[PDB]
Amino acid sequence: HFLCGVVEGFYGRPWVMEQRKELFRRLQKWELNTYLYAPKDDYKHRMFWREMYSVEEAEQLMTLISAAREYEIEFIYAISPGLDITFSNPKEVSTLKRKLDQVSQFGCRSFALLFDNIDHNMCAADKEVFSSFAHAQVSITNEIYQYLGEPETFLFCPTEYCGTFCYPNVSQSPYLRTVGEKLLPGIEVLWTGPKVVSKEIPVESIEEVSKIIKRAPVIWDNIHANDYDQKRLFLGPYKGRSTELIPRLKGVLTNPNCEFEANYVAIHTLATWYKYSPQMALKLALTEWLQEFGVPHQYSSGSVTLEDLQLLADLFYLPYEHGPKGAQMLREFQWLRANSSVVKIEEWRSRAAKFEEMCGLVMGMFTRLSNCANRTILYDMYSYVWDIKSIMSMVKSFVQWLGWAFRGGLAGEFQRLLPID
Amino acid sequence: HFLCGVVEGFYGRPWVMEQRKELFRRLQKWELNTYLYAPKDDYKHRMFWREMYSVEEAEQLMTLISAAREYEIEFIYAISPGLDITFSNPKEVSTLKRKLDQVSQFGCRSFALLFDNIDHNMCAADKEVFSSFAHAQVSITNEIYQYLGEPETFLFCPTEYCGTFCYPNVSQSPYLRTVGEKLLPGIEVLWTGPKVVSKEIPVESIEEVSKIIKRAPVIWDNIHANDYDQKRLFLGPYKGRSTELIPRLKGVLTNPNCEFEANYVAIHTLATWYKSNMLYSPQMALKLALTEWLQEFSVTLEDLQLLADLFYLPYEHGPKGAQMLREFQWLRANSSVVEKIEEWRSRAAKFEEMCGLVMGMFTRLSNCANRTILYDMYSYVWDIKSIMSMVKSFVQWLGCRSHSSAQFLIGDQEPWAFRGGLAGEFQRLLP
Amino acid sequence: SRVT
Amino acid sequence: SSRVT
Ligand SMILES: *[C@@H]1O[C@H](CO)[C@@H](O)[C@H](O)[C@H]1NC(C)=O
Ligand SMILES: *[C@@H]1O[C@H](CO)[C@@H](O)[C@H](O)[C@H]1NC(C)=O
């Protein structure tokens, strides 16, 4: 059974249960199957990981795992204990087992252990017991596997979870050789690609990693991940992963934007790709998303378009790429600024006009997005669309003036001073 | 009565009821009295001002207006029909009344009409019936004041609601002239200062406006508003406002940060400045607020002191923020010096440490217990935390230059070395 | 300032 | 430390 779905795997506010239930409706509607529970900053997933769910939280989680079953979505409960765990103390281990059990008794049939973004060293007690860092994860992992009874899905996220993160390189890695050889052939290995946010996940590279770990990996994809930049949102199509990768992979679990309602394209298209042109796949997704907008019902006395959503997506597209309308406006503004010294030049004025109208459409897009019925959708994207429309007003002004002191605040001030911006 | 507390008046995601109830609590706990309901993007407050609250909506408004009365907080409900209302048409007025009626029936005694941020012109029908735009606004506000039975508190935010916005100046403007003379003296008037978000409210200016509106205004205070700037958050003391104002004002309602749990300092300190003069020290207030706040969150006072200084006020960083900036501006300026330069090294060590503190603050905030407070500030705290890494590591780099000529970026990056996305790119081309 |  | 992606 190939795994395809979403991993709620990001830093910041986690999604509420009413949202996660909505996630399950959609995943089923788009014929996806998995959900990997892993929100870095949900209390007892990581920081206070040993601590057992209160009876009121135990109620909410059991209701969630049930809803997962209701919608034929497999629920994989992951735990990230690697911050401050002593790998050899059996009180640690017995507090892990006891927690996993607590979840097991909510329904949960599938699990995961995540050792990502943690110190490569370990305390002196464990220096004694295990030879390398790998060996200590492999050991506590393999035990917890057998303890729970070898469930059908069990996932392990390595510390060297992408190509750049392997020392010295992907193939000849002490750490990855130890995982490959000694991790029980039943459990699965997560992998984000060349880089943490891989622009491309090429086939060669998945073979280069599949050898060293003795198995086909499950992609934790951060293509649509947002947590790393307060001004970035990603609404462009799933892209840079060949459909040829499917024969060489056990899954793809996309770690998407923090804002729930902002992930309709990222997941719609992943499911399209699961059955590929990303330009086509977007249109399919934008066209279908548009119906979720609507305009409030009225018993008394301008509605968002497909051309609006195409512009929204193009301005908040992908990590390594702006959408076409975004790229174009940015080209046209670069040409207008650099040719401002020509004020025969009817060209500048005819292209000024066209860009001022391009700017106008961004303002129109926010006006209409503001008047829509789905306020959940509006609130989740508000501060993003606000920003784009206000920079565009400032840019519309500035172009006309050829014919923000504290902006960003302290962060912004320091950032302008770095010479790489 | 002198009105003092919070206007939920910002653009974007409004607060949910259980947030608004926890606010009423705090307004009482710190001896504040009023709450103006005017969140720009609760659709029935403005864009669909004509629309009656539904059944399930009604229960919420009613249960809210309850918790306000229970906590002796004075609920003012606002409505902003400014955009698309035809002022001259009787059926349009009837809707406005009918809706105000509907809310009256939830409990609401106090009301408000806002006419901020709208086109200064009006339609065909209004040009006939009304001599000026100002005449139109005062007419329906009067008619509505009298229809509701003339309640104790009833506000009017004008279109020209700050100094910068009066054509041509404050005293010489037809608009504010018309409002002073023709607008019923039982109606109060909202004012934000010389500007929309004011650095200082000088007493001289509040007199200059007191005369032309013919009364003591109520201040909508945008000082801690953060709805205009995605990267900005304001945890600074209530400041730039003279206690000497109190006597000359009918109130001060602070329009604060969208993130609810980050308004503790913003309101707590407004409380100490109301209480002090029913003089006052912004630096003291802050220390009181930050010590008290800390009970709610392992996170230290120093951590919060730093935090508040990093995210201080619209026109001013805090001491530890401003000094970190000075040093980094000095360190990069005098970096061409890689005897006589033991100074740069020993200061680059002082700096790399103060960066280490911002990292530690974040570790400790993320291990904290109060997750409501963590989540409301997470993206703000992660941003500074992470800009500081790139800064600390760039000072490091300038140092290890004596014995290297590697680039500052090692080859091909992760995305978060090139920030801001499209918006960010456009912005770095404005001069 | 910046804006409203 | 820092311990992040
Ligand atoms: C003006 O701008 C402030 C902050 O941008 C916003 O909160 C406020 O709602 C707008 N209107 C008025 C009257 O202040
Ligand atoms: C690494 O970075 C991504 C995006 O910053 C973050 O969501 C994720 O939690 C971290 N772990 C993995 C496997 O990506």
Residue numbers in the entry:
A (entry chain A): 59 to 333, 374 to 399, 551 to 592, 603 to 662, 679 to 696
B (entry chain C): 59 to 336, 373 to 391, 552 to 592, 602 to 694
C (entry chain D): -3 to 0
D (entry chain B): -4 to 0
Please share text taken word for word from the publication where this structure appeared.
OGA is the unique enzyme responsible for O-GlcNAc hydrolysis from a large number of cytoplasmic and nuclear proteins. Recently, our group and others have independently identified crystallizable constructs of OGA that comprise the catalytic domain and stalk domain, and published the apo form structures and enzyme complexes with active site inhibitors. These reports consistently showed that OGA formed an unusual arm-in-arm homodimer, where the catalytic domain of one monomer covered by the stalk domain of the sister monomer to create a potential substrate-binding cleft. Exploiting our previously reported construct of OGAcryst (residues 60–704 with the unstructured insert residues 401–552 replaced by a glycine–serine (GS) linker), we solved the structures of a mutant OGAcryst-D175N (catalytically impaired but retaining the ability to bind substrate) in apo form and in complex with each of four synthetic glycopeptides.
In the substrate complexes, all the glycopeptides were bound in the OGA substrate-binding cleft. Particularly, the GlcNAc moieties were anchored by the same set of OGA residues in the catalytic pocket, displaying nearly identical binding conformations regardless of the glycosylated residues or the flanking peptide sequences. Consistent with the O-GlcNAc hydrolysis mechanism, the catalytic residue D174 was optimally positioned to make a hydrogen bond with the N-acetyl group of GlcNAc in all the complexed structures. The N175 mutant side chain played an important role in anchoring the glycosylated hydroxyl of serine or threonine and stabilizing the OGA substrate complexes. Compared to the glycosylated serine, the extra methyl group of the glycosylated threonine (as found in ELK1 and Lamin B1 peptides in Fig. 2c, d) was well accommodated in the hydrophobic pocket harboring F223 and V254 residues from the top surface of the catalytic domain and W679 from the stalk domain of the sister monomer. Finally, in the OGA-Lamin B1 complex, the peptide was primarily stabilized by side chain specific interactions with the cleft surface residues: valine (-1 subsite) was engaged in hydrophobic and van der Waals interactions with W645, whereas arginine (-2 subsite) participated in forming a hydrogen bond with T626. We find that OGA is able to bind peptide substrates in different directions, but in a conserved conformation regardless of the glycosylation site or flanking sequences.
